Write an enzyme that holds these catalytic residues in place. Structure first.
Site, mmCIF file in Angstrom:
data_model
loop_
_atom_site.group_PDB
_atom_site.id
_atom_site.type_symbol
_atom_site.label_atom_id
_atom_site.label_comp_id
_atom_site.label_asym_id
_atom_site.label_seq_id
_atom_site.Cartn_x
_atom_site.Cartn_y
_atom_site.Cartn_z
ATOM 1 N N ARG A 37 0.845 -1.210 0.000
ATOM 2 C CA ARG A 37 0.000 0.000 0.000
ATOM 3 C C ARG A 37 0.875 1.252 0.000
ATOM 4 O O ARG A 37 1.934 1.248 0.650
ATOM 5 C CB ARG A 37 -0.863 0.037 1.266
ATOM 6 C CG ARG A 37 -0.911 1.399 1.955
ATOM 7 C CD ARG A 37 -1.007 1.179 3.406
ATOM 8 N NE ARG A 37 -0.229 1.895 4.398
ATOM 9 C CZ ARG A 37 1.057 2.156 4.373
ATOM 10 N NH1 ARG A 37 1.801 1.971 3.294
ATOM 11 N NH2 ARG A 37 1.575 2.706 5.447
ATOM 12 N N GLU A 43 -2.990 10.541 7.222
ATOM 13 C CA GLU A 43 -1.976 9.799 8.012
ATOM 14 C C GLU A 43 -2.272 9.979 9.505
ATOM 15 O O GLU A 43 -2.541 11.127 9.938
ATOM 16 C CB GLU A 43 -0.567 10.295 7.688
ATOM 17 C CG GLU A 43 0.437 9.168 7.566
ATOM 18 C CD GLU A 43 0.151 8.242 6.408
ATOM 19 O OE1 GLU A 43 -0.499 7.167 6.613
ATOM 20 O OE2 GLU A 43 0.593 8.594 5.301
ATOM 21 N N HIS A 44 -2.150 8.896 10.261
ATOM 22 C CA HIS A 44 -2.374 8.858 11.724
ATOM 23 C C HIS A 44 -3.805 9.291 12.032
ATOM 24 O O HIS A 44 -4.022 9.823 13.137
ATOM 25 C CB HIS A 44 -1.316 9.682 12.455
ATOM 26 C CG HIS A 44 -0.008 8.988 12.474
ATOM 27 N ND1 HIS A 44 0.276 7.999 13.397
ATOM 28 C CD2 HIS A 44 1.077 9.134 11.685
ATOM 29 C CE1 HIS A 44 1.500 7.573 13.180
ATOM 30 N NE2 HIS A 44 2.025 8.269 12.130
ATOM 31 N N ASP A 46 -6.429 6.689 10.923
ATOM 32 C CA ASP A 46 -7.208 5.412 10.948
ATOM 33 C C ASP A 46 -7.561 5.028 12.394
ATOM 34 O O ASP A 46 -8.751 4.761 12.655
ATOM 35 C CB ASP A 46 -6.540 4.269 10.181
ATOM 36 C CG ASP A 46 -5.184 3.828 10.659
ATOM 37 O OD1 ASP A 46 -4.593 4.576 11.464
ATOM 38 O OD2 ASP A 46 -4.748 2.702 10.233
ATOM 39 N N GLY A 138 8.119 0.651 4.580
ATOM 40 C CA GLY A 138 7.047 1.650 4.766
ATOM 41 C C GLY A 138 5.794 1.435 3.908
ATOM 42 O O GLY A 138 4.855 2.280 4.034
ATOM 43 N N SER A 140 3.835 -1.516 3.865
ATOM 44 C CA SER A 140 2.915 -2.497 4.506
ATOM 45 C C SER A 140 3.222 -3.933 4.069
ATOM 46 O O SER A 140 2.291 -4.672 3.680
ATOM 47 C CB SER A 140 1.503 -2.127 4.209
ATOM 48 O OG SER A 140 1.233 -0.864 4.764
ATOM 49 N N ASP A 186 -3.988 -0.597 6.614
ATOM 50 C CA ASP A 186 -3.060 -1.384 5.752
ATOM 51 C C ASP A 186 -3.770 -2.677 5.340
ATOM 52 O O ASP A 186 -3.733 -3.036 4.178
ATOM 53 C CB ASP A 186 -1.715 -1.629 6.438
ATOM 54 C CG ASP A 186 -0.942 -0.361 6.799
ATOM 55 O OD1 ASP A 186 -1.346 0.742 6.361
ATOM 56 O OD2 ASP A 186 0.071 -0.477 7.514
ATOM 57 N N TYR A 236 5.126 5.017 17.699
ATOM 58 C CA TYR A 236 3.779 4.665 17.157
ATOM 59 C C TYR A 236 2.801 4.540 18.326
ATOM 60 O O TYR A 236 1.826 5.296 18.408
ATOM 61 C CB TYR A 236 3.811 3.410 16.265
ATOM 62 C CG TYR A 236 2.513 3.198 15.542
ATOM 63 C CD1 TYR A 236 1.458 2.532 16.145
ATOM 64 C CD2 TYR A 236 2.294 3.771 14.302
ATOM 65 C CE1 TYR A 236 0.232 2.399 15.518
ATOM 66 C CE2 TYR A 236 1.071 3.655 13.665
ATOM 67 C CZ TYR A 236 0.040 2.955 14.267
ATOM 68 O OH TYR A 236 -1.171 2.862 13.646
HETATM 69 O O1 LIG Z 1 -1.234 6.737 8.841
HETATM 70 C C1 LIG Z 1 -0.435 6.045 9.783
HETATM 71 C C2 LIG Z 1 -0.472 4.582 9.514
HETATM 72 O O2 LIG Z 1 0.698 4.070 10.127
HETATM 73 C C3 LIG Z 1 0.650 2.776 9.518
HETATM 74 O O3 LIG Z 1 1.879 2.376 9.067
HETATM 75 C C4 LIG Z 1 -0.160 1.838 10.412
HETATM 76 O O4 LIG Z 1 0.171 0.475 10.173
HETATM 77 C C5 LIG Z 1 -1.568 2.246 9.933
HETATM 78 O O5 LIG Z 1 -2.601 1.488 10.562
HETATM 79 C C6 LIG Z 1 -1.688 3.771 10.065
HETATM 80 O O6 LIG Z 1 -1.825 4.087 11.435
#
Ligand SMILES: OC[C@H]1O[C@@H](O)[C@H](O)[C@@H](O)[C@H]1O
Ligand SMILES: O=C1CCCC2=C1C1(CCCCC1)N=C(Nc1nc3ccccc3o1)N2
Length: 392
Positions: A37, A43-44, A46, A138, A140, A186, A236
């Site tokens: 993916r 981003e951050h 989900d 990065g 997935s 992901d 994370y």
């Molecule tokens: O947008 C941030 C993303 O970081 C990813 O790599 C994580 O596996 C996802 O579920 C999402 O949180």
């Protein structure tokens, strides 16, 4: 400054098929694929029940296998980067004795999906695992392995659940067998991808919408920093807690329910970095809604601008960029024909994504490389299919 080849399913398949024959003395009965993916924007969000707009890549994990009669699981991976050994055997889990994370780490992903597989009776099987998804880079690779495993088990023992429940099993494996407490994006994109589309995912409602991304004038350039700071892993979970702290302080189920105005009014109910974490999420949800709308009406200049605001927000407020990604993004925004660039994925390393005129990709690759203090790797990727099955 040339784009790494994306092996077509057929070439990964033939490789998987040959290695299976050599290893187990018979043709495999079954093939499956699940892609990696790139997140275009969101981003951050989900795990904040926000909006994400990922697309599946041609980079994929392929698993070829057969059921066994002895209740045994026998695995081989040919993936360069996989920790030793490349082979592992274990008995199926039972009520008595459950499967357990350990060595090699790559098998924790298969073990987790087997452990939480919701249908019975699951037979044992033999399988070979191949991936073009760079391992931990990065895009997935883990989600791709989990989703390929789940698709395989479906052929061994069909489940009867939703795609979300399947994503939630793969997500459970990530959490419990790889210690990465990911959101759903992901696994969901790896399951739900469609050629020529991005996928808008509402991580509250779990509603999905296919969005066209197939214009020959336009490309998506993925750039691997080929770095991963330890914070990628350790910070994370910290951001997940900071976001939770802020949701609780405001009396909100999630930051999805919070607007900037509501957040600014409650400045003195949360910490300084707390407030910065929540300003990014609220803003990224809005920007993902706007990006989705922009992409639908062919407005790539607007899309690109929202990509740039997402990066700045992730740099300054969420603080999950690093000098490497920052240098790569600045490089790409200097190239004519580039609409936008941002970090994609968790941060602290990994990849950036760049939306550009296709004609500009070669000039972007040369310039990004020349301006980058490390050695960058490049993928030019169209939007690809999610999980697939081929009977052998
Ligand atoms: O947008 C941030 C993303 O970081 C990813 O790599 C994580 O596996 C996802 O579920 C999402 O949180
Ligand atoms: O060490 C980490 C931490 C960060 C994320 C990353 C892991 C490793 C762990 C095992 C060795 C390589 C790195 N692997 C993945 N993903 C992945 N490994 C695969 C093997 C075969 C097929 C598909 C695969 O996908 N994720």
């Amino acid at each position: 400054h040339a784009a790494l080849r994306q092996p077509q399913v057929a070439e990964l398949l033939a490789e998987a098929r040959r290695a299976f024959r050599e290893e187990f003395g018979a043709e495999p009965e079954l093939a499956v694929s699940a892609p990696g993916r790139v997140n275009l924007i969101g981003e951050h969000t989900d795990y904040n029940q926000g909006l994400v707009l990922p697309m599946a890549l041609e980079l994929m994990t392929v698993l070829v296998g057969s059921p066994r009669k002895d209740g045994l699981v026998s695995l081989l991976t040919t993936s360069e980067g996989a920790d030793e050994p490349q082979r592992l055997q274990f008995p199926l889990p039972t009520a008595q004795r459950s499967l357990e994370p350990g060595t090699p780490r790559w098998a924790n992903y298969v073990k987790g999906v087997i452990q939480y597989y919701p249908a019975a009776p699951l037979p044992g099987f033999s399988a070979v695992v191949v991936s073009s998804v760079p391992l931990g880079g990065g895009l997935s690779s883990s989600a791709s392995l989990e989703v390929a495993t789940y698709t395989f088990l479906q052929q061994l023992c069909p489940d009867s659940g939703t795609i979300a429940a399947r994503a939630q099993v793969c997500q459970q494996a990530e959490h419990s067998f790889a210690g990465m407490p990911c959101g759903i994006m992901d696994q969901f994109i790896s399951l739900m991808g469609q050629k020529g589309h991005a996928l808008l995912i509402d991580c509250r409602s779990l509603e999905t919408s296919l969005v066209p991304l197939s214009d020959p004038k336009l490309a998506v350039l993925i750039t691997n920093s080929n770095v991963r700071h330890s914070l990628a892993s350790s910070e994370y979970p910290v951001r997940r807690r900071q976001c939770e702290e802020v949701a609780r302080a405001l009396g909100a189920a999630s930051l999805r329910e919070v607007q900037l105005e509501e957040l600014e009014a409650a400045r003195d109910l949360v910490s300084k970095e707390g407030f910065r974490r929540a300003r990014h999420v609220v803003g990224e949800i809005r920007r993902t809604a706007q990006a989705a709308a922009a992409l639908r009406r062919g407005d790539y200049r607007a899309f690109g601008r929202l990509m740039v605001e997402s990066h700045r927000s992730l740099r300054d407020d969420y603080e999950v960029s690093c000098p490497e990604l920052d240098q790569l993004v600045e490089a790409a925004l200097a190239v004519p024909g580039v609409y936008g660039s941002r970090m994609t994925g968790g941060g602290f390393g990994g990849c950036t994504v760049t939306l550009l005129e296709a004609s500009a990709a070669p000039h972007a690759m040369r310039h990004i490389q020349e301006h980058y203090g490390g050695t960058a790797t490049f993928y030019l990727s169209q939007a690809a299919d999610g999980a697939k099955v081929l009977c052998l």
